[PDB]
């Protein structure tokens, strides 16, 4: 169902090579040829394979000593952690070519922890300019652990242990089932048991693979510990990019609440009790992951030091704010310019760019850590390498707390509070002179509910028979959210001829009143569908544009089984290779009802300004001097939101077959 | 005897057309003519008539836009209510001349909200220079719903919807009479139905009409949102007005405590209950005020981010306090300079001083804001124009509530850790070579109760008939309020070598409440300036009588609109209501006695006046001197570095006279 790319002989060989270290993540085959290579690989005696000879040796330091150690968790969050995956970071991307790439990466792939591996391994891989192109597993078939619900993973297991069905039919009943010798199991999303209140509403969002998946695509892409001098030019927007994507985020997470009858994100205080809970069905083999029961007081003696640092973190901001200009982190800051909006996002990400220097150092502290190792809920680590699990302690499960949203929802309100210092737009900057909306249309917009399949069998081991033969076929299916596709047109008058720049938005119509939503107070929730560039003809035109071509979704990862046929026929998936790092198209719209749902479509076209020729880090990056989110980027005057060449239409979003996805999985 | 001045026919026209549009203030006359000129008047065809052609743009632009709907409760403390506050007033302080001033007020009375007009309007009035001189009726008389207990308004609605008395006899049981062809209604203060608390003692003084509309001309002589350039040297003095104003309001108010038995206002934290509460017997047009029930938790699920906002910005007072000399709001300040004083008083006024700017922008969170709407228990606003008023929503309302005076103590406070960096004045600052007080004598000091009514005619609807006759005017309120008898201060100075001087007076406890008698080094904050004058001594013995009739630190009591208009065709004006507005009310001079006399002090202070280097006459001649206010008080003191011989300590006792229980005088006779 997905668009292909052609491609030649000498990348299949490479794009192999490199899916070839995601393959039973979790063993060692002896006979594969990552092992031999990685024997074979005198890491004392090639200095010379490296571009940055400080790196190599740092690297050689540090190796001397020793690493995580193998099977344990890991996690970017954790000091010494992080500055050996750095490390070893570093060696991947200084790699003078991609030869000494991959034995560096077997090299890895063998003697280290395998966390570690991966998580440097899928970054350098998006990061070294000569791997670019290439195409990565998605995170759910990488790292399946994080996106399994514990009673699916001991169904894999018992069925491992027992090599396959006893009784086909009590297999059955336990949504186990045999499909081309490959045995695929029913996931539903969790009970009251794992979201102890209103928030299990939404598991199907919050638990989705995309979703979660999407995120951890975001941090790969541009490590908050990373200088972002790759990019050139974008490193001057960082914040703003930071800003944008959680704001979008929350927008989009918002209208699933709306249809789900639970209004605003809660706001949450660091003195007080937090009232929603999580409890995951997670573990590591070593600790379960930590719960965060129903009013949890987050301000215990544990806490108070981080409590402690969060707050004038935070108070730092508010001083900001009140004095409007200040010097910080060297820089002269004022608040009226935009060289504010990458500060101030930079702020509140401690990334790298807020140092100005290339990676982020031991003792510089971050608020988002301890923001989450607070909310997080476990006991404190016992030692370096060891600490006890929580949700927020990986990008890949982040999305599944409720107190993510929470906490998310915080910085980007104090970011909203910076905007007030921001210039609103006047007529003059958002009137095209010359052209008029005069009619949006748009197809039925219908949600429903179809089934997903990834292949799971990273968490399962395998004997040293069949480790010969790299084994595969444990498949979660699972319902998951998804949408038909349709089409806008929009019709156009104008005088003359240029080339225009189309822009959608999704907003919410009401708030959980029944009360009109007023763009005041309703900017900020307003997503982003799609963005274009259209030539404009003198008087009457139509723009016909559909939901397939949006430009901010993609299609569905392909398992690497099937990334391994297209490659035998000279192809790959396009989304995987030139768009991983955007939103599943299946998301692209809450879930309606059979009646509607009552949202709004904001269609804005203003002129094409032929400008950057760039090499963008994310697709958020779009060829345009214009703020991300603008016209949206900033307060609105809503007089001014008037223009001919604006339109507000009211759409319903519908819903079609059954309305739980727990209906999708009964046996007989 | 009510102190008059006279004025020419071209003033008394000026005077009719402002005193207009505080009648019947809810309502329109289509046949006056403010509504012809207001229903017709075009701004954009006559922006020539404007000294400031952005602004009567800027304000074009927002009313295109929509101002806040008719009949609404206005409250300056919230944004958008605010900006079109200011942009009116804009239009009102850069009207060419008077005639455009007043078509735009009718303009503005036909279209815009009565609340946020009233508020513009009230202000323009004060601040235009062509109107000084000109009077404006008391606040009680243009708001008379905030200045009484639903009770009564109940009362008067009810005789207006019978249009008169049912039953003479049983109105008469309720306090209601009919003088004239005026309904008079007897009231009384919220604790003759409601004890909720010890802090009811005080509403005699906290419920009071004068101390209220003091409060509230404070604010329209020089509110936060706007700069003071047009008060010369004043501009480098704010932040010591505001500083002083409550530090002298804060001395009053616990003069009333103490002799209510009550001793110091509680401290209180963001994150803890506050124990008193307030439960307000208002009513607004739509709904009643805001309740805070005893043991109110400030710290609740709607304030977190409104007191991490609170707290930020003690805490960046108190880094300053820390730092001593630092660089903010690009200035350079250090404590130990006394000029400080501006920066900090402007900081916690969160002013357009602070930033120097004309006018402060939403950008620019106040503190005071924020604070008033926390401890005002209201929920959240609806929208941008529909809140629950709570009494700190409003200038004319704030004193009736506890928390205020725990809000403005604890800002007090903050200026008083400053006001410790400063070097306490030496032996030879204060004394005034060759000159002795040898004696003071003071009559005795007496208070008492006595009935005040005023008029309460814009709390009703009237009829299309009423308002073409003119018949709009019958609702009177009689209450009894505080009030002294006149007394005499008697000063015997001796001086080797004739000289010019000043004599300040101040009033202060004698005693803490262990009965211990305060030491100056305390409770120099404790001072409540009753008066300051000048005096020429010559070689020997001098004696200096001043009555308490000529204090210039307070003023007489209004004379009601009505009896303007009478004034008004004699040629005449209430001298008091022109020039001295914005003071402090005599008859609430002195805190309320006891039968035995409670014990007070008079501190009396003489010192040079050798010549007039800076003082201050736009704001008005308060500080004929470059002395700061409150000197020799205005900062902390070594009691034997001080005592010198031209100040003199006399112990005094204030008496009540009559019946001590205001209620008392309510009670129908039988
Ligand atoms: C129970 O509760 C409900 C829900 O709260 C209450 O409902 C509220 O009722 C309000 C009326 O009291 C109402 O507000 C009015 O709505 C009018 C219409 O609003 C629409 O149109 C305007 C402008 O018109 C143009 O719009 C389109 C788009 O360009 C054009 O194609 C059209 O052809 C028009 O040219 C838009 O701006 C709006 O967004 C709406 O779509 C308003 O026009 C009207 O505004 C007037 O009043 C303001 C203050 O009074 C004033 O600032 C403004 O300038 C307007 O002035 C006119 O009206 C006054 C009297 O109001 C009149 O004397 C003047 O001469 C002048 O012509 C109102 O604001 C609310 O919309 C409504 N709330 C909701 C959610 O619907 C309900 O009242 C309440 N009932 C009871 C019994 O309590
Ligand atoms: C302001 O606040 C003050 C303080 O409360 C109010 O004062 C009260 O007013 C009320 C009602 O107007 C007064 O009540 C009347 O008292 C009358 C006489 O004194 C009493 O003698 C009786 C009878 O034997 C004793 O038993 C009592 O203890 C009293 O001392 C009394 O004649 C009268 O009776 C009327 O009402 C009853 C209802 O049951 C009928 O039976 C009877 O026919 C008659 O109609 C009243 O009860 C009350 O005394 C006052 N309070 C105090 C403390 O003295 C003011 O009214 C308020 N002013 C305003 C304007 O609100
Ligand atoms: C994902 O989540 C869904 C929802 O939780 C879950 O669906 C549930 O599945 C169970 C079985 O898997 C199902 O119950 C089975 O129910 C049938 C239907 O019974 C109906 O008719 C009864 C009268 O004849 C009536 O009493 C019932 O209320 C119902 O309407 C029933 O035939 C089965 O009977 C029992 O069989 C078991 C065998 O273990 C015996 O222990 C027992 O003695 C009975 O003979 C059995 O109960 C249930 O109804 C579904 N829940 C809902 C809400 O619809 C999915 O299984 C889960 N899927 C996956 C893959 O995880």
Not at chain 1, 90 to 117: I, P, S
């Amino acid at each position: 169902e997905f668009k292909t790319t052609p491609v030649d002989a000498a990348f299949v060989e490479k794009q192999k090579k490199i899916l070839s270290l995601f393959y039973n993540v979790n063993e060692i085959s002896y006979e594969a040829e990552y092992y031999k290579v990685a024997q074979d690989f005198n890491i004392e005696a090639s200095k010379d394979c490296y571009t940055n000879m400080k790196a190599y040796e740092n690297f050689m330091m540090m190796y001397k000593v020793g690493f995580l150690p193998k099977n344990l968790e890991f996690s970017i969050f954790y000091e010494k952690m992080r500055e050996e995956a750095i490390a070893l970071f570093k060696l991947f991307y200084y790699a003078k070519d991609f030869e000494c790439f991959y034995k560096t990466a077997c090299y890895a792939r063998v003697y280290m922890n395998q966390g570690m591996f991966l998580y440097a391994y899928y970054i350098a891989i998006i990061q070294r300019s000569d791997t670019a192109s290439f195409v990565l597993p998605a995170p759910y078939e990488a790292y399946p652990q994080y996106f399994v619900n514990m009673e699916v993973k001991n169904k894999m297991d018992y069925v491992k242990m027992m090599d396959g069905c006893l009784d086909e039919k009590i297999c059955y009943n336990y949504g186990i089932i045999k499909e081309n010798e490959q045995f695929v199991m029913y996931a539903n999303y969790s009970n009251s048991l794992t979201y102890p209140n209103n928030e299990d509403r939404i598991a199907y969002l919050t638990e989705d693979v995309g979703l979660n998946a999407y995120y951890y695509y975001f941090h790969s892409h541009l490590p908050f510990w990373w200088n972002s001098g790759k990019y050139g030019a974008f490193k001057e927007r960082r914040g703003e990019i930071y800003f944008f994507f959680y704001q979008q985020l929350l927008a989009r997470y918002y209208m699933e609440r709306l249809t789900n009858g639970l209004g605003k994100i809660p706001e949450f205080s660091w003195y007080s009790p937090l009232r929603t809970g999580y409890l995951p069905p997670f573990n590591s083999f070593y600790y379960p992951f930590a719960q965060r029961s129903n009013d949890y007081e987050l301000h215990t003696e544990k806490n108070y030091e981080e409590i402690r640092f969060l707050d004038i973190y935070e108070k730092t901001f508010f001083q900001y704010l009140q004095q409007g200009h200040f010097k910080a982190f060297d820089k002269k800051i004022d608040l009226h310019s935009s060289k504010a909006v990458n500060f101030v996002g930079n702020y509140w990400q401690t990334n790298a760019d807020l140092f100005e220097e290339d990676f982020l150092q031991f003792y510089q502290r971050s608020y988002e850590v301890n923001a989450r190792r607070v909310l997080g809920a476990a006991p404190k680590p016992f030692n370096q390498y060891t600490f006890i699990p929580s949700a927020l302690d990986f990008y890949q499960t982040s999305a599944r707390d409720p107190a993510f949203y929470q906490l998310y929802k915080r910085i980007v309100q104090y970011i909203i509070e910076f905007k007030q210092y921001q210039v609103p737009y006047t007529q003059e900057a958002l009137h095209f002179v010359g052209l008029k909306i005069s009619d949006v249309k748009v197809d039925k917009m219908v949600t429903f509910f179809d089934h997903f399949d990834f292949d799971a069998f990273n968490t399962v081991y395998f004997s040293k028979e069949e480790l010969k033969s790299s084994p595969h076929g444990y498949k979660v299916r699972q319902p998951r959210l998804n949408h038909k596709p349709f089409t806008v047109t929009i019709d156009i008058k104008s005088d003359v001829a240029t080339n225009a720049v189309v822009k959608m938005f999704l907003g919410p119509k009401y708030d959980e009143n029944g009360f009109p939503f007023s763009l005041e107070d309703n900017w900020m929730n307003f997503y982003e569908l799609d963005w274009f560039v259209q030539k404009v003809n003198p008087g009457q035109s139509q723009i016909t544009r559909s939901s397939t071509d949006f430009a901010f979704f993609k299609e569905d990862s392909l398992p690497m089984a099937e990334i391994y046929k297209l490659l035998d026929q000279g192809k790959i998936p396009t989304d995987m290779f030139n768009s991983s790092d955007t939103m599943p198209s299946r998301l692209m719209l809450p879930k309606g009802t059979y009646d509607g749902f009552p949202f709004q479509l904001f269609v804005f076209v203003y002129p094409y300004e032929p400008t950057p020729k760039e090499s963008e880090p994310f697709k958020a990056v779009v060829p345009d001097n214009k703020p991300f989110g603008y016209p949206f980027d900033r307060p609105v005057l809503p007089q001014y939101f008037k223009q001919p060449n604006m339109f507000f239409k009211k759409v319903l979003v519908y819903h079609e077959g059954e309305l739980f996805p727990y209906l999708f999985n009964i046996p007989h | 005897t009510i102190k008059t001045k006279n004025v020419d026919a071209v003033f008394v026209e000026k005077q009719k057309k402002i005193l207009s549009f505080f009648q019947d203030v809810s309502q329109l006359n289509t046949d006056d003519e403010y509504y012809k000129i207001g229903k017709d008047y075009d701004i954009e065809m006559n922006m020539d008539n404007y000294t400031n052609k952005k602004a009567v743009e800027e304000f074009l632009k927002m009313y295109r836009t929509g101002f806040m709907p008719k009949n609404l409760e206005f409250s300056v403390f919230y944004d958008k209510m605010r900006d079109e506050a200011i942009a009116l007033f804009h239009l009102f302080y850069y009207a060419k001349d008077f005639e455009t001033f007043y078509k735009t007020a009718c303009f503005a009375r036909v279209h815009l909200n009565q609340g946020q007009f009233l508020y513009a309007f009230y202000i323009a009035v004060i601040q235009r220079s062509d109107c000084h001189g000109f009077v404006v009726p008391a606040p009680y008389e243009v708001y008379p719903k905030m200045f009484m207990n639903m009770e009564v308004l109940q009362k008067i609605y009810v005789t207006k919807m019978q249009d008169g008395l049912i039953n003479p006899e049983a109105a008469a049981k309720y306090g209601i009479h009919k003088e004239n062809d005026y309904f008079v209604y007897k009231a009384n203060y919220s604790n003759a139905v409601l004890y909720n608390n010890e802090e009811q003692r005080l509403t005699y003084f906290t419920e009071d009409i004068g101390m209220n509309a003091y409060y509230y001309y404070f604010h329209s002589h020089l509110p936060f949102w706007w700069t003071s350039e047009k008060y010369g040297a004043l501009k480098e003095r704010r932040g010591e007005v505001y500083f002083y104003f409550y530090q002298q309001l804060l001395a009053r108010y616990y003069f009333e405590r103490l002799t209510n038995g009550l001793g110091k206002i509680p401290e209180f934290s963001w994150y803890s209950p506050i124990k008193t509460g307030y439960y307000p017997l208002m009513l607004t047009k739509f709904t009643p005020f805001a309740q805070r029930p005893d043991y109110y938790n400030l710290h609740t699920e709607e304030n977190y981010e409104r007191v991490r906002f609170l707290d930020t910005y003690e805490k960046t007072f108190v880094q300053f306090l820390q730092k001593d000399h630092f660089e903010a709001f690009g200035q350079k300040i250090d404590f130990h300079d006394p000029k400080a004083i501006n920066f900090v008083g402007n900081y916690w006024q969160d002013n357009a001083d602070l930033y120097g700017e004309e006018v402060t922008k939403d950008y620019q969170r106040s503190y005071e804001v924020f604070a008033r709407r926390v401890l005002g228990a209201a929920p959240m606003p609806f929208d941008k124009y529909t809140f629950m008023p709570s009494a700190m929503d409003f200038y004319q309302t704030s004193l009736r509530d506890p928390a205020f005076y725990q809000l403005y103590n604890r800002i007090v406070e903050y200026i008083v850790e400053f006001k410790q960096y400063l070097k306490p004045y030496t032996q030879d600052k204060l004394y005034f070579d060759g000159v002795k007080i040898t004696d003071v004598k003071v009559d005795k000091l007496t208070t008492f109760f006595e009935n005040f009514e005023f008029d309460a005619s814009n709390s009703v609807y009237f009829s299309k008939e009423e308002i073409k006759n003119n018949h709009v005017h019958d609702v009177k309120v009689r209450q009894p309020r505080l009030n002294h008898s006149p007394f005499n201060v008697n000063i015997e100075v001796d001086s080797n070598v004739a000289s010019d001087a000043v004599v300040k007076i101040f009033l202060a406890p004698k005693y803490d409440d262990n009965g211990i008698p305060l030491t100056l080094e305390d409770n120099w904050m404790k001072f409540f300036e009753l008066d300051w004058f000048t005096t020429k001594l010559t070689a020997g013995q001098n004696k200096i009588i001043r009555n308490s009739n000529e204090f210039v630190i307070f003023k007489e009591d209004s004379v009601p609109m009505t009896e303007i208009m009478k004034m008004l065709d004699e040629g005449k004006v209430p001298f008091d209501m022109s020039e001295e507005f914005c003071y402090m009310p005599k008859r609430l001079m002195l805190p309320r006695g006891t039968e035995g006399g409670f014990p007070f002090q008079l501190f009396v202070f003489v010192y040079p006046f050798d010549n007039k280097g800076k003082d201050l006459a736009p704001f008005e001649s308060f500080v004929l001197d470059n002395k700061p206010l409150g000197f020799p008080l205005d900062r902390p003191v070594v009691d034997a570095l001080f005592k010198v011989p031209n100040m003199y300590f006399k112990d005094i006792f204030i008496y009540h006279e009559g019946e001590r229980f205001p209620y008392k005088f309510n009670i129908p006779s039988y």
